[model samples]
Target: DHYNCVSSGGQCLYSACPIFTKIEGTCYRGKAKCCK
Candidate 1:
């Protein structure tokens, strides 16, 4: 599934991932990573 971090206020589907960190408002298609 695709997730919109910016629309979700930096909350992504992978937010539960161990390495998922929201540092910016950007959308990551499938895998959410730390915003840069």
Candidate 2:
């Protein structure tokens, strides 16, 4: 299921989840990307 990052106070997906976060979910539907 979608993580609702667009409306659930979640940040946009990036190349990586930064120094504190980790890749935990998919961002786009076309191609799943790394997300926090």
Candidate 3:
């Protein structure tokens, strides 16, 4: 679930992460990735 990322304080984007965060997991079966 995308919540997996949210629960970990992550942001899901199109394979890119926000500043100060790293890739934590994938979303929508690789359609996007989670940044934490």
**Against the true structure, what is each candidate's TM-score?**
0.23, 0.41, 0.72
- Model 1 stretches with alpha carbons more than 4 Å out: 1-3, 11-36
Q: After superposition, how far is residue 23 of candidate 3 from its true place, in Å?
A: 0.6
2 or 3, greater by lDDT: 3
TM-score ranking from best to worst?
3, 2, 1
The list of candidate 3 runs beyond 4 A from truth reads: none
Clashing pairs in 2: none
Instruction: Tell me the lDDT of candidate 3.
Output: 0.80
Query: lDDT, candidate 2, residue 12?
Result: 56
Clashes of each: 0, 0, 0
Error of 1 at 24 (Å): 12
| lDDT score at residue 23, model 1, on the 0-100 scale | 52
Model 2 regions more than 4 Å off: 1-3, 6-9, 30-34
Evaluate model 3: give its TM-score: 0.72
Question: lDDT by residue for model 3 over 1-36, one digit each (tens)?
Answer: 478988877878885587898987888777888888
Error of 3 at 7 (Å): 1.4
Superior candidate under TM-score, 1 versus 3:
3
Clash pairs, model 3 backbone: none
1 or 3, greater by lDDT: 3
